[PDB]
Design a protein around this ligand. Structure first.
Ligand code: SF4
Ligand code: F3S
Length: 77
């Protein structure tokens, strides 16, 4: 799955929402999040975010690893 990290907070641009083929990006309050069980890993959302907040799970920066679980918790997992 792909993960929305720190940069989204305080921005919530939402350009990512319009390019996701499965509509699995949801409002999580302080940031949007990607539902892990729905995401098909097509990667379309990556170039769409103006603040580079989205990363494939395997490539999430070491400093932002906590966002993997955050997206999971927001998804209710
Ligand atoms: S990787 Fe594809 S399916 Fe997953 S959130 Fe991004 S646009 Fe949607
Ligand atoms: S700011 Fe957040 S709402 Fe989408 S376009 Fe970037 S991950």
């Amino acid at each position: 799955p792909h993960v929305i990290c720190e940069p989204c907070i305080g921005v919530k641009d939402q350009s990512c929402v319009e390019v996701c083929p499965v509509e699995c990006i949801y409002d999580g309050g302080d940031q949007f999040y990607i539902h892990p069980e729905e995401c098909i890993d097509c990667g379309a959302c990556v170039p769409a975010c103006p603040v580079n907040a989205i990363y494939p799970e395997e490539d999430v920066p070491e400093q932002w690893k906590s966002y993997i679980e955050k997206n999971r918790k927001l998804a209710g997992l």
